[PDB]
Amino acid sequence: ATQSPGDSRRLSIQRAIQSLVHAAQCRNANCSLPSCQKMKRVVQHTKGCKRKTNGGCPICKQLIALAAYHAKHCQENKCPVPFCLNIKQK
């Protein structure tokens, strides 16, 4: 009964995570999940820009934070995830 926007927000990132984590782990390139290709487009673009990788873009700013929550819960340095390496490896 707790379900609420707060849960919708958690579900919002879960779906983004499902693609971010998957798209950032499944570097197939031909991924059959439109969400992945579009996320790669986002990740592939995220790095393409150095200013953006610094949080310049709301996409990076928000993604870095989203990454912060995931990279935190994940006590293991996944490896393919750029940010995790930047936070956990550094």
């Binding site: 927000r9 983004a16 986002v42 873009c57 709301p58 996409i59 928000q62």
Partner: protein, 39 residues
Amino acid sequence: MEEPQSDPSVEPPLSQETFSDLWKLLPENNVLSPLPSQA
């Protein structure tokens, strides 16, 4: 406070809450510039 009540925390989920920003806030036609075997 105007009447709707706190909006910063009460954001009507459209299903693309995050997605929205992901591909629509792209600084410019995404860059695929591949990086040399870095990993």
